[PDB]
Amino acid sequence: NMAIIKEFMRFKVHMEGSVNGHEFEIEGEGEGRPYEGTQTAKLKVTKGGPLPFAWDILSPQFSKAYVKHPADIPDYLKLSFPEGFKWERVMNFEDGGVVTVTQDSSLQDGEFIYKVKLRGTNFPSDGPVMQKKTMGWVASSERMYPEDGALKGESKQRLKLKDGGHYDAEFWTTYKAKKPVQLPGAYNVNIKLDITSHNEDYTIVEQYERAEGRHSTGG
After folding, report:
1. Which run of H or E residues covers position 76?
2. Strand 38-47 to strand 134-137: parallel, antiparallel, or no bridges (unpaired)?
3. Which residues have C-beta within 8 Å of that of residue 90, sequence separation ≥ 6?
């Protein structure tokens, strides 16, 4: 519980982006329990729909204030509020596709405000992203560490495919508070991110995420 970060918190998110040159925008609203590590969101494509690419490359960009942390791991991103934090991400896919993301998180009138900019490039026209063959992310673990006054995370990620195969990516993210709050040591964040409902052309999508920090066991 907390005065700034309450046990139940809503957010609003705006994304502008392009993937292989296709421009789009998304608006959404979310809610969750920041100290329990759970959240949901409802997203709507508002420009450029229906998207000609897999929703799954967008789903991890819609909220790490909602990670459950044990008391002995400083919860840097919660401590950054009310001012908030920024994050920057590179996602390199095994077939050469690249997604870069920048994000601003703030708190306004008791709700989080998320502003996302996204650029996907170099996806093969034949690959599973532009052919919409992906079927969600496998549960994953983000390895966290402090560096140069920011919190960094790195993860190996895997998308399931309609043909029963998999499509891998590496994620690198830097999270920086707008004020100089306490950084944690190294630890792991276990993440499960699900698409819980969508319409036929993925112009209306709902997501759920559970995330929890746990002590590293070395790897």
Report:
1. helix 76-79
2. unpaired
3. 98, 99, 100, 171, 172, 173
Q: Measuring CA to CA, how many Å separate 41 from each of 9, 26, 184, 205, 207?
A: 12, 12, 27, 8, 5
Structure tokens at 80: 């950054």
Compute CA distances 130 → 75, 102, 151, 207, whole Å. 37, 22, 32, 21
Q: Which residues contact 218 (CB under 8 A, 6 or more apart)?
A: none
8 Å CB contact between 117 and 23 = no
Asked if residue 28 lies in contact with residue 13, where contact means CB atoms within 8 angstroms, the answer is yes
The span from the CA of 34 to the CA of 27, in Å, is 21
State the structure-solving technique.
X-ray
CA 49 from centre of chain: 21
Positive or negative, the CA dihedral 80, 81, 83, 84 is: positive
Please answer whether residues 25 and 47 qualify as being in contact, where contact means their C-beta atoms are separated by less than 8 angstroms.
Answer: yes
Q: How many other C-beta atoms are found inside a 10 Å radius of the C-beta of residue 107?
A: 18
